[PDB]
Write a protein that binds this ligand. Structure first.
Ligand SMILES: NCCOP(=O)(O)OC[C@H](O)CO
Ligand SMILES: [Ca+2]
Ligand SMILES: [Ca+2]
Ligand SMILES: [Ca+2]
Ligand SMILES: [Ca+2]
Ligand SMILES: [Ca+2]
Ligand SMILES: [Ca+2]
Ligand SMILES: [Ca+2]
Ligand SMILES: [Ca+2]
Ligand SMILES: [Ca+2]
Ligand SMILES: [Ca+2]
Length: 318
């Protein structure tokens, strides 16, 4: 049911492609067009094979070259696209965590939308790539129930979708109800446990009966009960349980809606998801927002960057 826009190129030849890329750069100038057209049409496995052949034919490192040539937002996107799939989340996470500050958004966005199977592979790589443990750095940078909700999620231990038990569904909607609305203050620790560990098929059933029992949708109670980065994170978890596609479509929308563009988010979501589920994110973008994603990107972005982005996106109207 899920599908991305970027696929493996039929009739690929690593060796052909590296000669175009060498020719696209050699000497004065840079043909940003031959690059952008080649790269947005090869799967990311295929960009790594193209980076292999470039170094065996020329003894040059394709990413460092491209980094010396290109600039600005375009460099940023092409560099994100040469990043191997199994390392790009690990990367966005390490660079969010490092330095004094920490960018909660990236942390929230990736740890909440990624499945368990994904979160495992991200800890694996992060460790073999940076020689730190992820959990430790997250804890090193955060505080409170936000840190704690992120550590629950980092354990990648959510329950399996199993046959559903109505009794447990009513049990769980009633405890949330008693942990928030019906409580002076809040019992955030019950929200972290039931939201952070129960199966996805089961909490979607909890979110409906809770609306029956309380007259509130769980997002609304989260708004009323909490503030800060924990409000954010619980909202991000609820929306990913309901739909990761729609949560990500919605994360792209608020990147482009405003007075500018959250470029870093625009890039990170299109590249990360290009091969996983950007076709579906595009469906939910339209369904929920009347604008199509192509369009939104077409009025927000200029340059080589825009063309690259739209090529990755595909389907206008879709
Ligand atoms: N619906 C209003 C929720 O207020 P609540 O978070 O449930 O209690 C306030 C806390 O004890 C303030 O210091
Ligand atoms: Ca050049
Ligand atoms: Ca140029
Ligand atoms: Ca540069
Ligand atoms: Ca930090
Ligand atoms: Ca911060
Ligand atoms: Ca800490
Ligand atoms: Ca309360
Ligand atoms: Ca509390
Ligand atoms: Ca709030
Ligand atoms: Ca805008």
């Amino acid at each position: 049911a899920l599908r991305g826009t970027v696929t493996d190129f039929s009739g690929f030849d690593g060796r052909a492609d590296a000669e175009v890329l060498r020719k696209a750069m050699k000497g004065l100038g840079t043909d940003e067009d031959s690059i952008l057209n080649l790269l947005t049409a090869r799967s990311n496995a295929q960009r790594q094979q193209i980076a292999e052949e470039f170094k065996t034919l020329f003894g040059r490192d394709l990413v460092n070259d491209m980094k010396s040539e290109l600039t600005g937002k375009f460099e940023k996107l092409i560099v994100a696209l040469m990043k191997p799939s199994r390392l790009y989340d690990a990367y966005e996470l390490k660079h969010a965590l490092k330095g004094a500050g920490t960018d909660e958004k990236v942390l929230t966005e990736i740890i909440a939308s990624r499945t368990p199977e994904e979160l495992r592979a991200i800890k694996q790589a992060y460790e073999e790539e940076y020689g730190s443990n992820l959990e430790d750095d997250v804890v090193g940078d955060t505080s409170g129930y936000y840190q704690r909700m992120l550590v629950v999620l980092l354990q990648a231990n959510r329950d399996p979708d199993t046959a559903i038990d109505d009794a447990q569904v009513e049990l769980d909607a009633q405890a949330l109800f008693q942990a928030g609305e019906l409580k002076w203050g809040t019992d955030e620790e019950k929200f972290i446990t039931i939201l952070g560990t129960r199966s996805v098929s089961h909490l979607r059933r909890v979110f409906d009966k809770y609306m029956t029992i309380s007259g509130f949708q769980i997002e609304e109670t989260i708004d009323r009960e909490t503030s800060g980065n924990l409000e954010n994170l619980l909202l991000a978890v609820v929306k990913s349980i309901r739909s990761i596609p729609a949560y990500l479509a919605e994360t792209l929308y608020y990147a482009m809606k405003g007075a500018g563009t959250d470029d870093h988010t625009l890039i990170r979501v299109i590249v990360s998801r290009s091969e996983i589920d950007l076709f579906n994110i595009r469906k939910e973008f339209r369904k929920n927002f009347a604008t199509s994603l192509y369009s939104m990107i077409k009025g927000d972005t200029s340059g080589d960057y825009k063309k690259a982005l739209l090529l990755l996106c595909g389907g206008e109207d879709d």
